[PDB]
Design a protein around this ligand. Structure first.
Ligand SMILES: Nc1cc(=O)[nH]c(=O)n1[C@@H]1O[C@H](COP(=O)(O)O)[C@@H](O)[C@H]1O
Ligand SMILES: Nc1cc(=O)[nH]c(=O)n1[C@@H]1O[C@H](COP(=O)(O)O)[C@@H](O)[C@H]1O
Lengths: 216, 214
């Protein structure tokens, strides 16, 4: 599994290059793993992945929540890995053929898929939650090794960990701004994802150091 | 929206030169192009403005937005700043996520299209069982534009029933995935067609043939 420094992944959702680079640079002593999503990529281009690599030498997880038909999923993954992403986040809700298409590209290109089962926001309770245990089981059956589950629902995060087993790698968003607690989340997740609590702080380095101290 | 010839081109070529050439070849037959992540992630969001400049077509951004409300609002902002007229959003992440997109679209004078049931086989596993409820959620939220599957005309018909004749419905899965253009247009206002046109020997003839059948 990826060795995430301090078990802390930065969700870099700032939307301009200058701020995103500044904040990431400020927290680089604490965090070697950066999640980059569409807010930054649609604002600055896929070449932002290259810039981050060049500047920081941090692993990059492309949080693209890939959720299309198998053929389009393959293309999205190929474009994403071409750009230098280490891993990509894929939705499970569209079903097994869609997830398999992503896994096939990742195997071909020597990269990793993270399967998003249950989401962290309240609306996830409407449709996703009821499918999430089966999505997770589908992942295990497909040979998925890396998973994403919600900090905001510790009981659900615990069930996801049970389903995937201790050997699988589990990362969890919803810590801080959405209400999840870092220590409680780390009972089940290998690493926590944190965005606004760090990138909106007056001193992102101090914010990162504080979270890390609180999980020692 | 008034889609010329009820035909929307799904421009999923991944190289700017091919995408512009092929779109140029079929421009006399369309006025609406769906641009997705294959082209955007390969060539940049500036491709949208380029399509507007070259073709003056309407642009639907097929981004199947599927994040938390806060991230959804950022995605929609970036997308509309790039010049998209509309964005496709998944309904399965629930009402708050959809609402976030609706809010941004209202601010910038654009439209949200709600994707309920998808066209590929895997849609049967989780999406299909939720699709009617997702459509009723769209109705509650005041969504006027929807996407449903050409490959399952009874499911497309049901979607039309739920949303009513006044809502706008577009449908992918025509051609390559097995959906029929004429049957799909019994229920949808417009069909989305990708590979059957853009992978054709003669894309212009492919489009003209389709339009001849409908
Ligand atoms: N991928 C995600 C799946 C999810 O269920 N929840 C979630 O917040 N995310 C993402 O994680 C990050 C959470 O950031 P924050 O709430 O710490 O700011 C954002 O990039 C979200 O888009
Ligand atoms: N947005 C979609 C929802 C969907 O359910 N099926 C689908 O194919 N799409 C998209 O429509 C287009 C279908 O293209 P083709 O099958 O005609 O090549 C592709 O861009 C897909 O990503």
């Amino acid at each position: 599994v990826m060795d995430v420094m301090n078990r802390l992944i930065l969700a870099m959702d700032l939307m301009n290059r200058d701020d995103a680079l500044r904040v990431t640079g400020e927290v680089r002593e604490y965090i070697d793993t950066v999640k980059i999503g569409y807010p930054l990529v649609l604002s600055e281009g896929m070449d932002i992945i290259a810039e981050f690599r060049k500047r920081f030498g941090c692993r990059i997880i492309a949080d693209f929540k890939v959720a299309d038909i198998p053929e389009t999923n393959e293309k999205i993954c190929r474009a994403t890995f071409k750009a230098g992403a280490d891993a990509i986040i894929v939705h499970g809700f569209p079903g097994a053929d869609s997830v398999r298409a992503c896994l096939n590209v990742a195997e071909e290109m020597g990269r990793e898929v993270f399967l998003l089962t249950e989401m962290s926001h309240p609306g996830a309770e409407m449709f996703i939650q009821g499918a999430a245990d089966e999505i997770a089981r589908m992942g295990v059956d497909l040979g998925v090794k890396n998973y994403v589950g919600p900090s905001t629902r510790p009981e659900r995060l615990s069930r996801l960990r049970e389903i995937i087993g201790q050997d699988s790698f589990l990362i969890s968003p919803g810590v801080g701004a959405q209400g999840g607690d870092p220590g409680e989340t780390l009972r089940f997740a290998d690493a926590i994802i944190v965005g606004r609590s760090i990138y909106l702080a007056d001193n992102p380095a101090a914010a990162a150091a504080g979270i890390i101290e609180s999980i020692k």
